[PDB]
Amino acid sequence: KIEEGKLVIWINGDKGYNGLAEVGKKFEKDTGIKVTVEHPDKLEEKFPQVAATGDGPDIIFWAHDRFGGYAQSGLLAEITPAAAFQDKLYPFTWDAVRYNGKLIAYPIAVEALSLIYNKDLLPNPPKTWEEIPALDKELKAKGKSALMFNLQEPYFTWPLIAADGGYAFKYAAGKYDIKDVGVDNAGAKAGLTFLVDLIKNKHMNADTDYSIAEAAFNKGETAMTINGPWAWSNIDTSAVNYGVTVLPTFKGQPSKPFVGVLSAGINAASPNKELAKEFLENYLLTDEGLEAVNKDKPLGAVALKSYEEELAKDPRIAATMENAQKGEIMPNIPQMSAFWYAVRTAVINAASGRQTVDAALAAAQTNAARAAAQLYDVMDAVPARRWKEFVRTLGLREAEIEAVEVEICRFRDQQYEMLKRWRQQQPAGLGAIYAALERMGLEGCAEDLRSRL
Numbered sequence: 001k002i003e004e005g006k007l008v009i010w011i012n013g014d015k016g017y018n019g020l021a022e023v024g025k026k027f028e029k030d031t032g033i034k035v036t037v038e039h040p041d042k043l044e045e046k047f048p049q050v051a052a053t054g055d056g057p058d059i060i061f062w063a064h065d066r067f068g069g070y071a072q073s074g075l076l077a078e079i080t081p082a083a084a085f086q087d088k089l090y091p092f093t094w095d096a097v098r099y100n101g102k103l104i105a106y107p108i109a110v111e112a113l114s115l116i117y118n119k120d121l122l123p124n125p126p127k128t129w130e131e132i133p134a135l136d137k138e139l140k141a142k143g144k145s146a147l148m149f150n151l152q153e154p155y156f157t158w159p160l161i162a163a164d165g166g167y168a169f170k171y172a173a174g175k176y177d178i179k180d181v182g183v184d185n186a187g188a189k190a191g192l193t194f195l196v197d198l199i200k201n202k203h204m205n206a207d208t209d210y211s212i213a214e215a216a217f218n219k220g221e222t223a224m225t226i227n228g229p230w231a232w233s234n235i236d237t238s239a240v241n242y243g244v245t246v247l248p249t250f251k252g253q254p255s256k257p258f259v260g261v262l263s264a265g266i267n268a269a270s271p272n273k274e275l276a277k278e279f280l281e282n283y284l285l286t287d288e289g290l291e292a293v294n295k296d297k298p299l300g301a302v303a304l305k306s307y308e309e310e311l312a313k314d315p316r317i318a319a320t321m322e323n324a325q326k327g328e329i330m331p332n333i334p335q336m337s338a339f340w341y342a343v344r345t346a347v348i349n350a351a352s353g354r355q356t357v358d359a360a361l362a363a364a365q366t367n368a369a370r371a372a373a374q375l376y377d378v379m380d381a382v383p384a385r386r387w388k389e390f391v392r393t394l395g396l397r398e399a400e401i402e403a404v405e406v407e408i409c410r411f412r413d414q415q416y417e418m419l420k421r422w423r424q425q426q427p428a429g430l431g432a433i434y435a436a437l438e439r440m441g442l443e444g445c446a447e448d449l450r451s452r453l
Contacts, residue, residue, distance in 0.1 A: 016296025045431030068332025069429020342367035
């Protein structure tokens with residue numbers, strides 16, 4: 001049970017948690033309610049484990065996509081901000097914290113990919129994707145490349161794919177249509193084809209990952225890269241004088257990067273829901289308080305208009321917000337994991353030639369909502385000899401283990417049926433798989449499996 005009359009806040013260690021504790025002490029001085037800020041490791045996965053038992057912090061700070069898994073299991077309380085208060089934040093940020101028509105969190109920061117260019121190598125960055133092939137040739141003579149970014153994660157490839165009509169799931173009313181996928185339309189085909197053509201014409205390498213791309217730009221080897229505000233810190237310790245601008249257009253249409261919103265949710269089992277609402281709306285989500293945490297460690301672009309026009313004087317933050325408003329809200333539904341699985345396979349296969357563009361996107365279209373691939377990954381991430389112990393630690397009842405064992409003959413088929421029946425009784429996103437592997441003493445399997453999501 002949670003201590004009543006007290007606020008416990010959980011925020012990641014990479015955020016300004018000292019500045020947040022400053023706003024909590026100011027809240028304690030005016031109300032007499034102690035606000036303790038904690039930054040536990042593996043924070044996004046211990047919260048749903050402790051919140052499932054009715055314990056945990058009163059407020060949780062994390063990206064909005066994970067809050068969909070929390071809300072579908074009922075771990076986050078519905079918030080009721082006044083219509084005048086909702087007007088104080090940018091309108092699209094409220095779309096990222098809405099689940100089943102209910103608002104489940106308060107938006108804090110806004111995050112999106114931007115085009116990062118070397119100002120010394122490139123005083124006038126290209127406005128369109130189509131200028132890049134020609135400039136790369138004029139630049140490859142001098143030993144450098146025009147553009148280098150992570151081609152291994154579809155998150156970095158999506159802005160081009162979505163520019164001319166691509167999308168994950170269509171959002172209408174207050175729901176995502178899982179049977180309306182937009183990775184196989186003409187817009188996605190053209191975007192992925194342009195990317196593959198860049199590789200076939202040897203303007204990019206299909207094997208370029210995140211570490212290769214960041215090192216090449218920070219050492220002046222390439223003129224441009226595609227990255228978010230999280231990478232700004234490494235570029236300043238580097239000797240490169242860089243700028244951050246809008247992403248290039250494709251067929252006259254803007255690039256559409258996925259938008260992530262740092263959000264603050266309230267524990268559904270917290271007896272201090274009203275005190276938490278008072279702290280977030282009146283003390284944190286103001287120009288001061290948001291500045292208090294920003295001076296500890298920057299937030300980048302924020303959802304508060306008044307303080308963002310403040311932060312937007314930084315042209316890099318202004319480009320982050322501009323690319324965000326041209327982009328798409330990252331959906332918070334569980335099918336987004338299968339979407340990433342399907343799209344990552346498609347981009348990698350199309351970039352390597354294993355699949356044609358339309359065959360890769362046709363497969364990703366069908367696989368976009370199929371979750372089987374993630375369950376089969378779990379089966380090969382756990383030693384076969386420890387499977388029943390792993391299934392037991394996950395919480396699958398013994399009566400269910402025995403029911404699968406007596407009717408299913410082969411070993412692999414038993415494993416999948418157990419995981420399938422466990423998934424139908426406990427929905428994903430609560431970190432139960434990783435939590436189960438750590439208690440089994442298999443922290444290497446958990447760590448290695450956790451890094452691949």
